[PDB]
Amino acid sequence: ATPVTIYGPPLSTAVSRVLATLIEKDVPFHLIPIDLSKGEQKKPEYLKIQPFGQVPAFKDESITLFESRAICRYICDKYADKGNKSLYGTDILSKANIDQWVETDGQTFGPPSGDLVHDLLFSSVPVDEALIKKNVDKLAKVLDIYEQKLGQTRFLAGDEFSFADLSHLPNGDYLVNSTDKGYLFTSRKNVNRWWTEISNRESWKKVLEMRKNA
Amino acid sequence: ATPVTIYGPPLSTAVSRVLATLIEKDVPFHLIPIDLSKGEQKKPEYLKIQPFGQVPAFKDESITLFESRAICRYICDKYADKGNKSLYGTDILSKANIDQWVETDGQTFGPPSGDLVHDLLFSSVPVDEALIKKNVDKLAKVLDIYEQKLGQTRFLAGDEFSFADLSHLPNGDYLVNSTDKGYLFTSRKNVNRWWTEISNRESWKKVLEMRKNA
Ligand SMILES: N[C@@H](CCC(=O)N[C@@H](CS)C(=O)NCC(=O)O)C(=O)O
Ligand SMILES: N[C@@H](CCC(=O)N[C@@H](CS)C(=O)NCC(=O)O)C(=O)O
């Protein structure tokens, strides 16, 4: 079928989540730029597609979607028999087992890690060290629980890479490789192990290379 | 069939989300109390099933799950042909269409509404009115977008009540009925219509009565 259409820059964490999923699932795509520096996402034209004025948006022959994790669940559903077939499970039980850790990204890991990424890399107000520390300490608590989980299983939800792991890549990679807070991940033995395995997957390497290609 | 097991108090918003789903899906359940004021959610036996020391947790013969929205997706999947069949759609496209608004709850509406609910109703320290204002203003911006959407469709995702609407009930109901922030919903005519329709569903009324009697 025709390549799907993704709106937004690969530097965006939420866009990156979608891109990594497409690549894992062997789904071809067009990428339409949205210039965040020109406030393009906040103007009326883009608002028809993403009503919160955020990236990414998704369009294929059947539907227009927003919210990165919903886009990714759709892709995993539509293209279940394609690419990495086990990415979001293969039946009701394996899917749900992964999904609880996807929700842990969305509700538990994502808020402090995303706020850190924003405040340290993408904000225009002076960095507030007290606020950085607050979210560092919150994220440390989460990663302590991950350290124990990853002492039992190779990946968050079990023995194989899943969307739960994938969903951690965007904020993880900015913290580890673009801030001085990488020790949160790398000083925890099992988290470091996991982080190394997931960030060196072909799909993620391809996303990082796409960022270089502008 | 054997009733599923749910852990936590009905005063909890995340527990309420699961209860409303079970009732919509006509799934019998057994509810195991956890007293949050007494830290029962941190008892080591309970942390074995919910490692973040939060509620709810879910058990049936097949699986133990945490994170309310993951639990609800599993319920909707397992019991697709039961109760309200359309709650999370009936095929790939209708499911995804609902799911983007479920993610909007999780990522956009949920954080400011949940922080308001916590600071105003479940905090041990005084409220910070500057922070209240910050979250009120954030939520107002979200609801301005909903106001536009709900002028186009009856419910968030279309012409039928869905899990997307359901997922807004717990924080919405506390703000409308237990704080002086209800104007956020009631001053917006389409949002108010929607709120009226979804909060008067029998499933939601049953949850509130469970809570009143707990
Ligand atoms: N919850 C959304 C988050 C989207 C989001 O916040 N995107 C950022 C880039 S990572 C954005 O659009 N920034 C520009 C803006 O918010 O105006 C998702 O997962 O898709
Ligand atoms: N993202 C979780 C949220 C769980 C959560 O924060 N639960 C509250 C109840 S509203 C709780 O357990 N609070 C007690 C605590 O965190 O110690 C879910 O949706 O299940």
Residue numbers in the entry:
A (entry chain B), B (entry chain A): 2 to 215
Question: How is this structure described in the published paper?
Answer:
Glutathione transferases (GSTs; EC 2.5.1.18) represent a ubiquitous multigenic family of enzymes that conjugate the reduced tripeptide glutathione (GSH, γ-Glu-Cys-Gly) on a wide range of endogenous and exogenous electrophilic molecules. At the structural level, GSTFs exist as homodimers, the dimerization interface involving mainly hydrophobic surface patches. Each monomer comprises an active site region formed by a glutathione binding pocket (G-site) primarily involving residues from the conserved N-terminal thioredoxin domain and an hydrophobic pocket (H-site) primarily involving residues from the less conserved C-terminal domain. A PttGSTF1 monomer consists of an N-terminal domain (β1α1β2α2β3β4α3) and a C-terminal domain composed of α-helices (α4α5α6α6′α7α8) as classically observed in most GST classes.
The analysis of the Fourier difference maps of PttGSTF1 revealed the presence of two ligands in the active site in each monomer: a glutathione molecule originating from the pre-treatment performed with an excess of GSH and a MES molecule present in the crystallization buffer. They are located respectively in the G and H sites. Currently, we do not have any evidence for a GSH-conjugation reaction with MES nor data for any non-catalytic binding. Both glutathione and MES molecules were refined with complementary occupancies. Therefore, PttGSTF1 structure can be described as two structures: PttGSTF1 in complex with glutathione and PttGSTF1 in complex with a MES molecule. In PttGSTF1, a glutathione molecule is positioned in the G site groove which is mainly populated by polar residues from the N-terminal domain. The thiol group of the cysteine of the GSH moiety is quasi-equidistant to the hydroxyl groups of Ser13 and Thr14 (3.2 and 3.4 Å respectively). While Ser13 likely corresponds to the catalytic residue found in most GSTFs and is the primary candidate for GSH activation, the hydroxyl group of the adjacent Thr14 is found approximately at the same distance in the PttGSTF1 structure. With regard to the electrophilic substrate site, a MES molecule occupies the position adopted by other substrates in known GSTF structures. The MES molecule is surrounded by the hydrophobic residues Leu12, Leu37 and Phe123. Moreover, the oxygen atom of the morpholino ring is hydrogen-bonded to the NH and OH groups of Thr14 and the sulfonic group forms a salt bridge with His119.
